[PDB]
Amino acid sequence: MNDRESLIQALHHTRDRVKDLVCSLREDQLSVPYHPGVNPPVWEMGHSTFFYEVFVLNWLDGTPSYDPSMDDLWDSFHMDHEDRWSKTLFPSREDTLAYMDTIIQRMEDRIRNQPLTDEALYLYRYAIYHQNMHVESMTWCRQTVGYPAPPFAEPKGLTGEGVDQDARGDATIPAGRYLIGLPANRDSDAYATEDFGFDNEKPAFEVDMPEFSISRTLVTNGEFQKFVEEGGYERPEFWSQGGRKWLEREINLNFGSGEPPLMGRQTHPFHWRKRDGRWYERVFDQWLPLEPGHPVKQISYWEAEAFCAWAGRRLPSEYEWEVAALANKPGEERRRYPWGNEMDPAKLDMDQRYMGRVPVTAFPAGESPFGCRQMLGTVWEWTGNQFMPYDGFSVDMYPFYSTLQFATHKTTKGGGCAASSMLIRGTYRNFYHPDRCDVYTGFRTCALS
Residues that bind Fe ion (CB under 5 A): 76
CB-nearer residue toward Fe ion: 50 or 284:
50
Q: Which is nearer to Na ion, 380 or 390 (CB)?
A: 380
Strands 170-173 and 212-215, by their bridges, are antiparallel
Give whichever of 142 and 297 is closer to Na ion, judged by the CB atom: 297
From the CB of 128, what's the least distance to Fe ion, in Å?
13
In whole angstroms, the minimum distance from the beta carbon of 374 to Na ion comes to 6
Nearer to Na ion, 150 or 414 (CB): 414
Task: Give 218 or 424: the residue with its C-beta nearer to Fe ion.
Answer: 424
Between 127 and 283, whose beta carbon lies closer to Fe ion? 127
Q: How far is the CB of 10 from Fe ion (least distance, A)?
A: 18
Beta carbon of residue 84, minimum distance to Fe ion (angstroms, whole number):
12
Q: What's the CA gap between 356 and 235, in Å, rounded?
A: 29
The option from Na ion, Fe ion, none interacting with 426 (CB < 5 to 8 A, set by class) reads none
For the chain, the C-alpha Rg in angstroms (whole number) is 22
What's the min distance (Å) between Cβ of 133 and Fe ion?
Answer: 6
Cβ 419 to Na ion, closest distance in Å?
10
**Cα pseudo-dihedral 429, 197, 154, 225, rounded to 10:** -10
What is the C-alpha separation between 308 and 310, in angstroms, rounded? 6
Residue closer to Fe ion, measured from CB, 74 or 122 = 74
Write down the least CB distance from residue 401 to Na ion, Å: 22
Shortest distance, CB of residue 319 to Na ion, whole angstroms? 16
Minimum Å distance from CB 131 to Fe ion?
Answer: 9
Q: Which of residues 401-440 bind Na ion (CB under 5 A)?
A: 414
> Closest Cα to residue 123, out of 62, 189, 199, 55?
55
Give the one entry of Fe ion, Na ion, none that residue 414 binds, where binding means its C-beta sits below a cut-off of 5 to 8 angstroms depending on kind.
Na ion
Instruction: Tell me which residue has its CB nearest to Na ion.
Output: 414
- Specify the residue, 192 or 446, whose C-beta has the smaller distance to Na ion: 446
Q: Which does 352 bind (CB under 5 to 8 A by kind): Fe ion, Na ion, none?
A: none
Partner in contact with 14, chosen from Na ion, Fe ion, none, beta carbon below 5 to 8 Å by kind = none
Residue 49 contact partner, candidates Na ion, Fe ion, none, CB within 5 to 8 A by sort of partner: none
- DSSP-derived pairing of the beta strands 176-180 and 205-209: antiparallel
CB of 276 to Fe ion, least distance (A): 43
Return the amino acid letter for 228.
Answer: V
Of 217 and 378, the one with the shorter C-beta distance to Na ion is: 378
Output the smallest distance, CB 51 to Fe ion, in A.
7
Judged by CB under 5 A, does residue 338 bind Na ion? Answer: no
8 A C-beta contact, residue 423 and residue 331: no
Please identify, using beta-carbon distances, which residue of 328 and 421 lies nearer to Na ion: 421
Can you tell me the distance from the alpha carbon of 93 to that of 404, in angstroms, rounded to the nearest whole number?
30
- Which residues 353-392 are close enough to bind Na ion by CB under 5 A? 378, 381
Three-class HEC string of the chain:
CCCHHHHHHHHHHHHHHHHHHHHCCCHHHHCCCCCCCCCCHHHHHHHHHHHHHHHHHHHHHCCCCCCHHHHHCCCCCCCCCHHHHCCCCCCCHHHHHHHHHHHHHHHHHHHHHCCCCHHHHHHHHHHHHHHHHHHHHHHHHHHHHCCCCCCCCCCCCCCCCCCCCCCCCEEEECCEEEEECCCCHHHCCCCCCCCCCCHHHCCCEEEEECCEEEECCCCEHHHHHHHHHCCHHHCHHHCCHHHHHHHCCCEECCCCCCCCCCEECCCCCCCEEEECCEEEEEECCEEEECCCCCECCCCCHHHHHHHHHHCCCECCCHHHHHHHHHCCCCCCCCCCECCECCCCHHHCCCCCCCCCCCCCCCCHHHCCCCCCCCCCCCCEEEEEEECCCCCCCCCCCCCHHHHCCCCCCEEEEECCCCCCHHHCCCCCCEEECCCCCCCCEECCCECCC
Comparing CB distances to Fe ion, the nearer of 90 and 270 is 90
Interacting residue ranges for Na ion, rule: CB under 5 A: 378, 381, 414
